[PDB]
Design a protein around this ligand. Structure first.
Ligand SMILES: [Li+]
Ligand SMILES: [Li+]
Lengths: 337, 337, 337, 337, 337, 337
């Protein structure tokens, strides 16, 4: 709870600021509402566990847009005290029970048919709320029950970012006519060493088609699998341009409760409506100019921080039109420790 | 050990201050001595685990007022170093072994026939030493063995407290002729929002007969049960008076080792000799005047803090002569976070 | 240096982040460059003290766009180590001397003819670098010497902010059809209690013409004057609209070294090019609808925090079409403690 | 402000708890009210500085029970925000101005005729608010002006305290029949090493008549004098009894504004009505039995802590019926560091 | 990870300082290299887990001085990022895989045939890296697999240390002719109360032959055994001299993978080449002069700290030519809390 | 007292450890004793201020080896409590008065004829106790009075340190046959970036004769002078060898109270008996081989840390057989922030 930094994590969720940003995310919130809508009939007399309910929005969707047997809304932060009043004021305190408890030390009156949760962090895994979700799945989800989302994908693409490199590195060349170029090394180390949250990747700055590189099956994935997640990639560049680095985002997928129904997707990428996650930019130390037909191949590794359990390091290995050990570049981005 | 705040908890017990207050509590200490006395014969050749022995007083009662096979005195604080000398100076180092260990990571040479411990916090559960006690019971207590105390009760009663309300809220009306009434809202928020430890409830200020609202069976209760403890209550007011709030206390019960013997009680309530726990007062934001025949019904919930594992919140729900949802009042007291 | 929080203040300036934001502010940086340009002849053989030179940009303007006798560039943060290299790489280490010292404990080889500094914080005074500037003026500026800026103004205007009130307060009414209105009180307390940095006030949202309310003469102002700065205001509303609160900004003025020359202004308000300061928004708890001819009169007080010497509280008193004590509203905004 | 621990000192005064204890002290508050009453005529058109006004009670006494020209109520804690409303609600905002400032960095519109303050700490000096008072006297009090209190006295007496020694030291001899005497050395070191705040000395436990040992003239005393305050004492014991140690208290004296009037005293000793300060007990390591005619002579030293400027150490030197260097005992009590 | 103080423990290993001291220890590093050499043939196609590989030295010995199937090099500190480059630069990235993970939450692709680790702390157990080693053994070591070291011994001997006692205690008698003897009690408490790391015990200062007092079988020892380790000792003094206290060291033993091969030892005692551990000195409060034929008998206890899990207390019980309870001395040394 | 870190500075001096190291320094302590001896007659009826007396050793030298009128022994740490007993036990409490006060807020009964103090830190200035000494000189030293030491010198010399460079940088080339050379850059940054305290420079490793580069006149030096101390140097190398860097030490000089007497020196350099200060080594990033007749010229700057007032940075500028701007190297060593 210290190397999980639980006081700070859950303290940030006791304030309205973070909830205001989540409910203002329309693609994110309306996706969950449509999953409940699209599955309303199948959810009747089911028992739902809303893990990390926050203000309770997903629980109210279940209770008001369907007729389940019961909904267990679980929130560890102080916001749970208000959730209890919100479900009362929306006429749902006969269906929704609110537990101010952590998923880890959770006691529910029965097992559940569906576990629904909005746990995705930056680059899917940041803050590792996924670990809580999986612990509660193992203890409380019935065999054959539903996980919502049911799978999740990490997608990447080699990209351009002239805006970022010129304002943070090439800016120092001649501002107002002065030679501040000596600061470029420290600009490199301070600005390009860390990932850039809330990057808005424009479609015309993709140098290939994005590829899913990691996929998580929410029914089979084990907590031990999250220690070290790695995927392979190969890209053939389709526009001539400048390879400044990689942009990353995720997708969440929601299987229909019934065989015959189609899946619902939450896409945080550049061809979908922007979300509060936006995309995440990882810049190379030095840009390299590419041209159509070039191949950028390698791997991406999401290595969990062994001490600070809410953090991870993302390591890129890549190669340009070569398969040799000596042309292989690497770079490691902390997120955040 | 950080969200258990073990350095501060066990640091406070390394000082004589807290032990002086425990041994100065005669009802508390003499009760344990009489349990050993009243059960002396049955304890012969039994093995006793004194969990959290402190100065070792309960262990010395066992070794000197009975003839057990062995006594394991377990103390995690630095006071254990002195316990070892105290048992030597009282001629008991052939019977009593002292382990400077936490109950949680405890290795004893054999299982035990009796687990005796003085673990009760404010309103029974504050600081949740009960969790340590139950872990050690599961690992070290033999099947059929004794838990002392064997059960524990939480008792409440609707009460008066003119002293408290006038000195902390109505004081501000006209002190020395000045109108300091603007401070009443902040008096309400600062003084009446938290429980008052060491309240001495006078018998003439009970507005009904006290009722046990929660009961813990020390043999069957599970650690998972302590996350959320709730009880129901109904009171018919017997004196006309003013309902300022509720007073809370506990009882500990000690079953005889032999069928035929009677139980021994440790009562911390207002009709028993005062203890170092006294009673605990929970005041309403605004007092309400009641009269004989009125019914005050509702529930009390002891919800454990999910982050700070030594803390909890106590939530009261109550209703006066009505059973409707819209006349239902609630108030939540932190203890302490 | 603790209630000045100097380790955090100067630590933030050892990183390129804050310098990148200052040099990217073109109105701010080009104003200083034009002051040097417009006064180039008058600055010859003058001695300049650049107080808090940062990267050294103002010092390089002096040394390269004029021919002073000497420039003393004073920087307390670790960035001074790099300033020394930057002035060398720009061929100015014969004119510019760099001192890694605080203004307060500063030893310069001679007194100076001009003290130039960019000290303005949010609402002019936030962080009170003005105090350092005035101490160095008293110890090191020659009688008759120049202060740049030579005066500074705080300007305010009653404003609209539909965007802010609807997204932070009225949002909770019916998001996705749920009644989250119970959270409005906590939205009020969390979002509207503090000033909003980096507000971009649109001209069509001014309900009157802005008025300078406080003016600082950099030659006569004393450090003791900064404890409590107060100004009076009266506004006649010119558009019908909704009075959500007040927007605040500042101006810095630069007198010509020679009688005959005109002053140069740095305007951070809504009718000037946007700066890294933008404007600062102070919202009322509840909006009030106004119409042409209405008068909003009162005062604004900038009260320095007695303990945390980089902080202050801004208190608004105002009245609408009345001069009576009982229609007088007040509200106090911390910035930040 | 760190070795003054100003955040904690002034944070404790932002809460109603400490103000409730001060206004509940009737001898303390009514003394100040009677000083204003007894001097009402002489205070007309005078300017009063209420240093550390807290809730503003002394300022309201001045404005309502006299007709001064103006009252400056100075409070560094956040309580000042409420003081401003309290003086408005009591119809005094034409006479009383409230400054949320520290005495040290204080700017008042004029000098003052009377400086009235309630600054006394435990044993007069604890927390050294006296230093603030003297700084403000030097900057703001007119020549010939009044200091209220005008002098202050520290009084001591050799005493008995059977209650304290038996419960904290001799208790360990045979509690419940166990030999816990090994803990006596640690009882001595933990309980008798520090002064005991809120001791209530009974008159029958004085072994001589109390003597003033230190006297402070509020007009002539300098801040440099507070570093090290020392007084001499000789006592002839009048009852036979046991010398457990010394009890200490103080007096504050209030000279009449006019020659012909008598002084008003605030006595915190054992022959006066009890105050929130009570008295302060300093126990010897070992008690010594005394009998009528014995002389206990020596000194008491109030040595200010050089690092933690709100703290001090009190050192006792004493001798019983001897004047030799080798029978001279010493003991040093921290308060609190 | 807080009562394990993992941020500080693993932060110290992210710096080269501690690795420089380990690789500069030739007896320590060459022992591991010779274990790999002496067992090279038997290690072919085995899978090795190097637990806590640091710079990776043991892993490079395995990969370069033998031909295993694979080596898993596990390092929780930030040094792992460099380990990955070092194994690449030494041509071993086909055999050695580097995991930046804690042993506790470790996921390896297969089980292992040999677990090799250098975990020994001061007096063998300080910092309790042994706990990590045993957890990884239980999860990842195949039945019948090898532990390196395979056993470990704690050795002690009664010793002389004139140097230490004269410089730290008897020094104060007459330095430069002044009588500073009053400081001896505080010298005793400050200097002799704690163990002395990096003591270099000379052979002529042993008063008997050293004896192994505790032995750990790395295959059978359980984590629960480390809570409290105790051994017995008897010494007959062989030189006449002064008994200042006890010196302690350890041995690590490495069984051959094949029955027929002999064991390899790492000896940190006084008759072996000095290591970075040196020896550890525990001084008595007062020295006692001994003569040939005297018997010093008792026990040594390594009691783990229940709160700070990297720490322990070492308690000595001893007796000189007597077997009586009243001649039995004890002394407890913290290491370090 | 926070950016002076007074709690840690003076807390380290409350322990015997640092006093044991000072009194064990014979050259340091005997020098002060001989200054008192050599000046015994001249000190009769003089008043001496021993600033920062510690255990009181210098005060006892004055009182026992001379007959002054009075000695004021001033110590801010808790050790002062023991100093008072030590002067009593050495029969000097009629001559020596002990004040537990900081020099800064010091009140002495009279001015003094001699101020004697042992204030020298590493490289003379580290920890800037010199500032306290100079403040007390200005307030308490009579005109014409003596400062002991009366002057102080900083000496430097270009040096060799094969031991240091090979063990910390070249070690990584081939330890045990592995190529750990990739770590050399981080060895450079971690080991050679900071000064090395307690370096023992051997005479045969001086590449020229040492030169005093900075000199402090204790009568004329002002506190404002300590902000930035700079000296110039030129060295002609006399042995052929390798220029690894510079070694630094200091001298303290003690003028005779009488014209006719000679000065006494405390030399901490390599040709004098070693002191607890030893010497301080500053290594270049890369060594350069020099030969007889080469000139190494430049400057050394002791720049005080503006925030952490006990710290400084030492900046070296140097040039080898050239006077051009482009062959000029620089390197800055923190000490310690
Ligand atoms: Li922690
Ligand atoms: Li601080």
């Amino acid at each position: 709870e210290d190397a999980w930094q639980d006081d700070e994590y859950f303290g940030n969720y006791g304030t309205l600021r973070l909830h205001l940003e989540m409910l203002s995310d329309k693609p994110r919130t309306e996706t969950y509402r449509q999953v409940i809508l699209s599955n309303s009939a199948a959810l009747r007399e089911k028992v739902v566990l809303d893990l990390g309910c926050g203000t309770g929005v997903i629980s109210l969707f279940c209770a008001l847009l369907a007729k389940p047997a019961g909904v267990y809304a679980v929130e560890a932060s102080s916001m749970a005290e208000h959730t209890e009043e919100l479900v009362k004021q929306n006429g749902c305190d006969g269906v929704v029970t609110v537990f101010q408890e952590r998923a880890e030390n959770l006691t529910l009156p029965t097992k559940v048919d569906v576990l629904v949760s909005e746990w995705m962090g930056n680059c899917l895994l940041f803050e590792y709320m996924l670990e809580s979700v999986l612990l509660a799945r193992d203890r409380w989800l019935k065999k054959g029950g539903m996980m919502w989302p049911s799978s999740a994908c990490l997608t990447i693409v080699p990209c351009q970012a002239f805006s970022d490199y010129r304002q943070k590195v090439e800016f120092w060349e001649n501002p107002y006519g002065l030679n501040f170029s000596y600061l470029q090394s420290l600009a490199q180390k301070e600005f390009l060493s860390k990932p850039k949250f809330s990057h808005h990747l424009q479609p015309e700055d993709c140098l290939s088609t994005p590829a899913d590189v990691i996929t998580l099956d929410m029914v089979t994935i084990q907590v031990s699998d999250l220690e070290r997640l790695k995927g392979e990639f190969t890209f053939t560049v389709e526009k001539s341009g400048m390879f400044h680095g990689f942009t990353v985002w995720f997708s969440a997928h929601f299987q229909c409760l019934e065989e015959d129904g189609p899946s619902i997707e939450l896409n945080t990428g550049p061809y979908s409506e922007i979300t509060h996650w936006k995309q995440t930019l990882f810049m190379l130390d030095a840009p390299v100019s590419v041209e159509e037909g070039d191949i950028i191949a390698g791997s991406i590794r999401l290595q969990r921080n062994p001490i600070w359990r809410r953090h991870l390091s993302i390591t890129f290995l890549w190669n340009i039109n070569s398969t040799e050990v000596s042309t292989v570049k690497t770079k490691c981005f902390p997120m955040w420790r």
